[PDB]
Design a protein around this motif. Structure first.
Motif, PDB file in Angstrom:
ATOM      1  N   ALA A 124       0.828  -1.199   0.000  1.00  0.00           N
ATOM      2  CA  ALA A 124       0.000   0.000   0.000  1.00  0.00           C
ATOM      3  C   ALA A 124       0.865   1.251   0.000  1.00  0.00           C
ATOM      4  O   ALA A 124       0.619   2.195  -0.764  1.00  0.00           O
ATOM      5  N   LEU A 125       1.906   1.260   0.833  1.00  0.00           N
ATOM      6  CA  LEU A 125       2.792   2.418   0.889  1.00  0.00           C
ATOM      7  C   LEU A 125       3.549   2.596  -0.421  1.00  0.00           C
ATOM      8  O   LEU A 125       3.742   3.725  -0.892  1.00  0.00           O
ATOM      9  N   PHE A 141      -6.278 -13.508 -10.883  1.00  0.00           N
ATOM     10  CA  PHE A 141      -5.365 -13.851 -11.969  1.00  0.00           C
ATOM     11  C   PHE A 141      -5.569 -12.943 -13.176  1.00  0.00           C
ATOM     12  O   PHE A 141      -4.599 -12.548 -13.834  1.00  0.00           O
ATOM     13  N   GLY A 142      -6.822 -12.601 -13.483  1.00  0.00           N
ATOM     14  CA  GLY A 142      -7.082 -11.700 -14.594  1.00  0.00           C
ATOM     15  C   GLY A 142      -6.518 -10.314 -14.356  1.00  0.00           C
ATOM     16  O   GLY A 142      -5.996  -9.677 -15.273  1.00  0.00           O
ATOM     17  N   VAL A 143      -6.617  -9.830 -13.116  1.00  0.00           N
ATOM     18  CA  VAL A 143      -6.015  -8.549 -12.753  1.00  0.00           C
ATOM     19  C   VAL A 143      -4.505  -8.605 -12.937  1.00  0.00           C
ATOM     20  O   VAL A 143      -3.890  -7.683 -13.494  1.00  0.00           O
ATOM     21  N   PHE A 144      -3.893  -9.698 -12.470  1.00  0.00           N
ATOM     22  CA  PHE A 144      -2.459  -9.905 -12.650  1.00  0.00           C
ATOM     23  C   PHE A 144      -2.069  -9.816 -14.120  1.00  0.00           C
ATOM     24  O   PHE A 144      -1.173  -9.049 -14.494  1.00  0.00           O
ATOM     25  N   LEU A 145      -2.755 -10.577 -14.970  1.00  0.00           N
ATOM     26  CA  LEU A 145      -2.383 -10.620 -16.379  1.00  0.00           C
ATOM     27  C   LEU A 145      -2.678  -9.307 -17.093  1.00  0.00           C
ATOM     28  O   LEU A 145      -1.925  -8.919 -17.991  1.00  0.00           O
ATOM     29  N   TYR A 205       1.573  -7.018  -8.776  1.00  0.00           N
ATOM     30  CA  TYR A 205       1.947  -7.799  -7.601  1.00  0.00           C
ATOM     31  C   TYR A 205       0.722  -8.161  -6.779  1.00  0.00           C
ATOM     32  O   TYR A 205       0.574  -9.306  -6.343  1.00  0.00           O
ATOM     33  N   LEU A 206      -0.173  -7.193  -6.577  1.00  0.00           N
ATOM     34  CA  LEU A 206      -1.417  -7.443  -5.852  1.00  0.00           C
ATOM     35  C   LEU A 206      -2.263  -8.508  -6.528  1.00  0.00           C
ATOM     36  O   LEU A 206      -2.734  -9.445  -5.871  1.00  0.00           O
ATOM     37  N   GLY A 207      -2.490  -8.363  -7.834  1.00  0.00           N
ATOM     38  CA  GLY A 207      -3.344  -9.315  -8.529  1.00  0.00           C
ATOM     39  C   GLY A 207      -2.802 -10.729  -8.464  1.00  0.00           C
ATOM     40  O   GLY A 207      -3.518 -11.668  -8.083  1.00  0.00           O
TER      41      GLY A 207
END
Lengths: 313, 73, 73, 73, 73, 73, 72, 73, 73, 73, 74, 73, 73
Positions: free
Chosen positions: A154-155, A206-210, A175-177
């Motif tokens: 977050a930071l 996974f979709g957010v990651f990709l 990284y979050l996804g």
């Protein structure tokens, strides 16, 4: 809250305009040490050592270490005495919920209450009930790390936004996804599955990651996502070190109690003498053994997830 | 009363011990080199240090396999 | 009998373990050489680190074949 | 389920693992000497690439053996 | 079939893996010397590759041993 | 009956693999030194080839032992 | 006849370990010998003798293999 | 219990093989020393020879004890 | 029965022992380097103590899985 | 039955084998050093003799152990 | 709880403690050799050498305590 | 149950042999250093004899273990 | 008694042998260095003797664990 920044000061400064990372470790490091130790008896002798150190403090003149040739801190020594106060009440409270210290005093009579052994105070955690409860405790340990990982990401996102450094912010979003996808998938597959609820959220993570990766197409750091998975998995040591220390203390008290019993009417004196000698020497080793692990963890994971090794202020 | 549980134990024991052996083999040489580099420079500090942290993922792999084969129980 | 799957499990564990240790025995020497070369160099470290991260696919192969042989169950 | 299948799994795993060990023990020396060269020359880098890539057929050969044993399974 | 198929499986696996590690240490020393030479001469590539390819025939020996025994099963 | 053919075969495998190990161990050092010599010489290739063709008799012994064993099979 | 497989694996590791011993012996002595060769063409024949010398070990291993084969 | 002879044989075989390995490394080092002595002197060859013929008494012990334990059969 | 618990014990013991061995050899190399550096310096000693007291993650994971196996009673 | 003497024979063989191995390990280094000294010296020959002949203790102990176990046989 | 289980856990004890002792000896070899090499001419810094050589013994005590507790299962 | 006696024979043999290997691997470097020193000195031989004779306690411990196990037998 | 006694014996032997050999290699390196140092020095013998004395605590541990694992009678 102030003194710990002197401990931070042993490493390099950060670049100006960035986040001031000091205040977290005042609340986090003595927390971690308390989670480790639970040896309130060591805290007592340690408090005597602190009395001796304050004896130097009123003896304001700074000593030199004979072997290491190190001139004393005395102002920074007092800063130590403060942080030692922090870690000592943390030690005290964690040993309180771990109420047996030196080991498990309830051998001969009911010092503590258990479901098995009657006693005065029904204690919460033993080293035998951890045949069942260690799994839950390790789960708590994992959650402890994921909390600080979430704080760090977050930071890092916030500073990437502030700097107009959107590339690093986008990498953090990826990284979050990836993190949430693999975490939830592993939790489902290893533990109870319950596919009717969470499969959609794993697919979305996974979709957010990709999607973040493809917008950041240029040959990025999927191995570094693997390393950050290593980073979150690395913090598990907190449970194991304290468990080993408690097991050793219980062994020492078992030795002392057996010497009290099987060695006739006079076995108590020699049992306590041997137990004290062995206890003091093993603590002399294991204190310096244990101290550096949480600060190592905070250093490497927090400041690699954060990332500041540039321009050194 | 299946006898497979002790087999599970010895298998995960071999896995974790072999992983520890290999990573320690890495750590010895790379740490000695890092000691030399920092002792001469002190500015190669983190750059040398991350190499020491590289092989731990090898440990966590075999840890993951050990954990899933434990969860099969 | 059900004792089959324990044996396949110990096979997976030993296999991935010594794959990891072979990885480590490569990594120690090559990393020491690379970090010395960069302590001299300070610039070639990108190629040095890709050399370090190059051979590791062997343990990936071992773990994936272990995965499919477990999924045989 | 059959007792022999655990045996064939164990054999496959140990085969590919020892092949991995041989690959690593090759890679250590060859990568060390190669990077020692490339750190100063940087022009024989493709030759070093060929040198490092050449011995890698052993592990894929071993996993082909593992595949055909799974086929017999 | 029986367990004897598992035993011949483990036998060929250990044979081929142990041959693989021998070939690995061979290729280690050979590749080190070869890159040390080829960094300067850049013409002894043919004899270097010949030296490298020599023990792979010894690997093919274990290949044919595994082949004949899996024909026997 | 049974329970023996796999045992004789794993015996063949271990014998031939160990012979392979010993031969490769010899070939490593002797070939590396020979490579250094021939690189410095470029004229002594015949004696280098002579020294390289030494160890393989051990593997020959192992494989013929396996041949007579599976013949007695 | 499980004893046949037992004695088979026994002679197998016996002769294999013999092969390792001669392998390391020839490794060291030949590694020295090739460096000697560059000027030691006078001592070349002696280098052949010293290289050939440790073979008695593996022929002992072969003898053990043969006597086991005769016993079976 | 006719299975006695099998483990009798494996015990004597591993005994003589391991004694053989000990002599193998012994003659390796002492032969290196002997040829290093030869590199500067002619007359010391017989001395180096008797040094390197010293350690074989242990393998003759192993084979004789193997023979006399076979005589029990 | 209950022999499964003995198999638990041997697996955890070998695991922690192998981790101990790897940590010990890593400590050997890093300690030699560090004590040389301190004997020269006496001012850089704290970093050397850090490098010595890094790699205990291996053995503590070994004890972790060991007591997991013990609590599997 | 025969299993008894088979086990004791296995023990005898293994014990004498690695006693011989330890002797080879010691003898390689001590003989190399003694030859290196006596090549230039050729005067301390008796001291070389005693330093080489010193370590027979372990093999004679193992021989006596084998003899007493055979007397038990 | 069994017949052969006592000896089985015993060989487990042996594995653990023996491998730990071997690793400790491996550490102690190099560290003691370097330390005595320094103190040969130093004659003063024996203290830092001894505080180096004492710390690997934790690796011993882990194995011995594990063997001790599994024996105390009895 | 004489198979118990065979087991204790195996244990005694492995104990004494491993102790023998340890004292041999000690005596290797100890004798090398001692013979170098006494070639330098020719008068300090008594200290050399003491330092070589010191590690006998290991094989002493092994043999007394064997004796007491026979006494229990 | 019973077979469990033989298992006790083999475990005790394994422990004491490993401890003996670890002490042996430790004493090998440290005593080589100490023999050299005392060869030039003659005065620092206390340091060398205490340095050779310190590793013996491990085989003392072996002593005590063997005794207590014998105490079951």
């Amino acid at each position: 809250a102030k003194p710990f920044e002197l401990l931070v000061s042993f490493l390099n400064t950060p670049k100006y305009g960035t986040f001031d990372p000091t205040p977290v470790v005042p609340v986090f490091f003595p927390f971690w040490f308390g989670m480790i130790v639970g040896d309130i008896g060591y805290a007592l002798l340690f408090y005597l050592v602190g009395r001796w150190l304050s004896g130097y403090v009123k003896r304001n003149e700074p000593l030199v270490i004979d072997l290491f040739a190190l001139k004393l801190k005395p102002q920074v020594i007092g800063k130590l005495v403060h942080i030692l106060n922090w870690m000592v009440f943390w030690t005290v409270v964690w040993g309180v919920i771990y109420g047996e210290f030196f080991g498990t005093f309830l051998e001969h009579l009911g010092v503590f209450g258990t479901p098995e052994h009657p006693g005065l105070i029904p204690i919460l955690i033993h080293r035998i009930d951890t045949a069942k409860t260690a799994n839950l405790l390790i789960l708590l340990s994992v959650a402890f790390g994921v909390v600080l990982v979430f704080f760090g990401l977050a930071l890092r996102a916030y500073l990437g936004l502030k700097h107009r450094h959107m590339a690093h912010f986008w990498e953090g979003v990826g990284y979050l996804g990836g993190l949430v996808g693999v975490l939830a998938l592993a939790a489902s597959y290893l533990g109870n599955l319950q596919a009717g609820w969470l499969q959609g959220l794993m697919y979305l993570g996974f979709g957010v990651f990709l999607l973040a990766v493809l917008m950041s197409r240029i040959w990025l750091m999927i191995p570094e996502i693997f390393t950050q998975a290593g980073h979150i998995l690395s913090h598990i040591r907190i449970y194991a070190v304290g468990a080993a220390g408690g097991i050793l203390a219980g062994l020492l008290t078992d030795v002392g109690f057996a010497l009290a019993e099987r060695l006739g009417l006079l076995g108590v004196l020699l049992g306590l003498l041997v137990a004290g000698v062995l206890h003091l020497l093993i603590l002399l080793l294991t204190t310096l053994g244990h101290m550096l692990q949480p600060i190592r963890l905070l250093w490497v994971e927090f400041f690699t997830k954060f990332g500041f090794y540039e321009e050194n202020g | 009363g299946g006898l497979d549980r002790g087999l599970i134990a010895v298998g995960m024991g071999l896995a974790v011990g072999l992983a520890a052996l290999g990573t320690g083999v890495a750590q010895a040489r790379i740490g000695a080199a890092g000691v030399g580099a920092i002792a001469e420079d002190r500015s190669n500090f983190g750059t040398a240090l991350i190499f020491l942290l590289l092989p731990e993922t090898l440990v966590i792999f075999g840890l993951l396999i050990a954990f899933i084969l434990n969860g099969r129980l």
